[PDB]
Write an enzyme that holds these catalytic residues in place. Structure first.
Site, mmCIF file in Angstrom:
data_model
loop_
_atom_site.group_PDB
_atom_site.id
_atom_site.type_symbol
_atom_site.label_atom_id
_atom_site.label_comp_id
_atom_site.label_asym_id
_atom_site.label_seq_id
_atom_site.Cartn_x
_atom_site.Cartn_y
_atom_site.Cartn_z
ATOM 1 N N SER A 173 -0.084 16.533 3.161
ATOM 2 C CA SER A 173 -1.218 17.103 3.336
ATOM 3 C C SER A 173 -1.537 18.248 4.013
ATOM 4 C CB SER A 173 -1.993 15.863 4.344
ATOM 5 O OG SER A 173 -1.327 15.901 5.652
ATOM 6 N N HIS A 182 -1.640 19.822 9.687
ATOM 7 C CA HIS A 182 -3.088 19.856 9.267
ATOM 8 C C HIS A 182 -3.542 21.515 9.651
ATOM 9 C CE1 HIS A 182 -2.915 15.493 9.494
ATOM 10 N NE2 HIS A 182 -3.149 15.767 8.108
HETATM 11 O O1 LIG Z 1 -1.684 12.791 4.742
HETATM 12 C C1 LIG Z 1 -1.391 13.468 5.555
HETATM 13 N N1 LIG Z 1 -2.342 13.868 6.724
HETATM 14 C C2 LIG Z 1 -3.424 12.915 7.045
HETATM 15 C C3 LIG Z 1 -4.239 12.528 5.648
HETATM 16 C C4 LIG Z 1 -4.473 10.959 5.937
HETATM 17 C C5 LIG Z 1 -4.010 10.056 4.472
HETATM 18 C C6 LIG Z 1 -4.524 8.873 4.744
HETATM 19 C C7 LIG Z 1 -5.862 8.486 4.207
HETATM 20 C C8 LIG Z 1 -6.225 7.048 4.653
HETATM 21 C C9 LIG Z 1 -5.297 6.237 4.951
HETATM 22 C C10 LIG Z 1 -4.151 6.453 4.870
HETATM 23 C C11 LIG Z 1 -3.537 7.624 5.063
#
Ligand SMILES: O=CNCCCCc1ccccc1
EC number: 3.4.21.105
Lengths: 180, 6
Positions: A110, A163
């Site tokens: 992410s 993030h």
């Molecule tokens: O992934 C990396 N950071 C946060 C993004 C959230 C991903 C997610 C969304 C909904 C449920 C579980 C994980």
């Protein structure tokens, strides 16, 4: 919407995800996590491979979704090499900031995805000739995700550093790209 | 375990 860079990264996250189901999450963290011991300092893949670990179906599906769409966007319009650099840089900086804030026990694409959100957005506001723009649907959804992170309204601890660092990188990069 | 999700 999926060139070789987009494709290999998904396969990689899939292959890693499968490896975490067979061997368990913990053993794959031991090999791919950001260096959590001086000894591991020089296992250099670790400064990137944290981006490959996902801890649940939700994690990997949402990350791979964004990745496929924005990353596959960057790939076909701007070129494979550009997506490569975005990914290397964001993965590195997001990892660094995340680990500085919460230790090394984190994972997920992410950080990279947030750099793609920030890049595809800002590049289109300053250089709409690029052909690169974050459609307003996604501007909204990207905003929401972000806010979801900062205020932590899912079940699991969010990688807030990864993030913020992620988004910073993608802005700086689209900024440098829109100069002319 | 707890791990941070990126
Ligand atoms: O992934 C990396 N950071 C946060 C993004 C959230 C991903 C997610 C969304 C909904 C449920 C579980 C994980």
């Amino acid at each position: 919407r999926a060139g070789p860079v987009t494709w290999v990264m998904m396969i990689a996250c899939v292959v890693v995800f499968i490896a975490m189901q067979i061997l368990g999450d913990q053993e794959v963290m031991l090999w791919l996590a950001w260096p959590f011991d001086p000894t591991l300092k020089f296992e250099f893949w670790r400064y990137f491979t944290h981006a490959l670990m996902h801890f649940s179906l939700m994690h990997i599906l949402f990350n791979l979704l964004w990745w496929w769409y924005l990353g596959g966007a960057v790939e076909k319009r701007l070129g494979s090499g550009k997506l490569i650099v975005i990914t290397l840089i964001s993965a590195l900086l997001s990892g660094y900031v995340q680990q500085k804030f919460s230790g090394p026990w984190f994972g997920g694409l992410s950080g990279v995805v947030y750099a793609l959100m920030g890049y595809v957005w800002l590049r289109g506001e300053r250089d709409p000739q690029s052909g690169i723009y974050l459609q307003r649907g996604l501007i909204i959804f990207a905003l929401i995700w972000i806010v979801a992170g900062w205020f932590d309204l899912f079940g699991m601890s969010m990688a807030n550093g990864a993030h913020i660092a992620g988004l910073a990188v993608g802005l700086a990069m689209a900024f440098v790209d829109s100069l002319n | 375990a707890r791990v941070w999700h990126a």
